[PDB]
Amino acid sequence: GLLDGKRILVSGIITDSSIAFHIARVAQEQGAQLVLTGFDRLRLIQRITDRLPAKAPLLELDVQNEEHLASLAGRVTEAIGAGNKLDGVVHSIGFMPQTGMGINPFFDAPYADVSKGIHISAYSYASMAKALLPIMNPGGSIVGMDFDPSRAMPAYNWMTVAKSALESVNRFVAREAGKYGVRSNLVAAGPIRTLAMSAGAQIQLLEEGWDQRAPIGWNMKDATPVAKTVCALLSDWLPATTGDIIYADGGAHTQLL
Structure with missing residues (x-):
């Protein structure tokens, strides 16, 4: 039990192909007690989370909603029991409107969307x-999901810009979280077939190039390697790593081709 008796909040489950879903699954297999947050289609999300190996309370969280954020800690402590704190937080939330992505020209995305x-x-x-952070224990770990934005690439467009911003935000979160003995890191994943992927020739060349570049290969169908990596960061086995990015991408980013 890599995560034996750790209390861990996990956001961003919308389907059972969500990366968050596999993080939640692997965490439970490893003894974690989870709290879950979901965004919009709450009834649908509850049905999806029923398929996890264990029961976990489900809280409504729209990160754009200031009231939801203000009430979050209180709502969490109620679910895990007063006197108890979190050892783990997983941010697995991404969104960009269609105008900011894919076939739509980079220059035509209006700022409101971006x-x-x-x-x-x-x-x-x-x-x-x-x-x-106020309801987190020392030794705790915050983890977010990244897609390496250090080089531009077709289609990913303004989401790449968002990820670049995220990486920078992560380094500052690490400063604040450090005052609580809490680590903050990002996992940079290779591409994965999720619901979000749904939203062409160059993206396919990017994927196939992925497996080819990756010295141990890369399998877009399999979220388990990134789930494990996230669990490794939630654990106690990376205690001196913070403000950082761990690459769960088959090693692709280390190879030019």
């Missing part, structure tokens, strides 16, 4: 940390 995407994808990592 701003919303940045709000949800980058700024929310800080506001979740603000809301939850």
